[PDB]
Design a protein around this ligand. Structure first.
Ligand SMILES: [Ca+2]
Length: 104
């Protein structure tokens, strides 16, 4: 059901490590990155198109074409976890998104 295996959530240190990268990917300096920006970033990690869309699905909550700062941190989190061998959720855990690190 809504119970899913929990994850060690993003730390301020994780969010910060992602945020620096965000500045590098956000070429429009809008506070969001574009689909192209995001894909190219993830493609540099040699991620599959399947993972690419899946990470997007988990990250882009507000269903907009762009990955926002929070979402981006989520994306990279999922991506790092993916490379660690941990499978990508069918639904991004609420404890990850509603975590204080993404709130602050
Ligand atoms: Ca978004």
């Amino acid at each position: 059901g809504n119970n899913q295996p929990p994850w060690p959530k993003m730390k301020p240190s994780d969010v910060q490590k992602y945020t620096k990268v965000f500045m590098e990917v956000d070429s429009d300096k809008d506070g969001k990155i574009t689909g192209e920006q995001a894909r190219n970033l993830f493609l540099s990690w040699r991620l599959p198109r399947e993972v690419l869309k899946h990470v997007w699905e988990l990250s882009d909550q507000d269903n907009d074409t762009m990955l926002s700062l929070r979402e981006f941190c989520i994306s990279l989190y999922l991506m790092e976890r993916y490379r660690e061998g941990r499978p990508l959720p069918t639904a991004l855990p609420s404890s990850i998104m509603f975590d204080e690190t993404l709130l602050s």
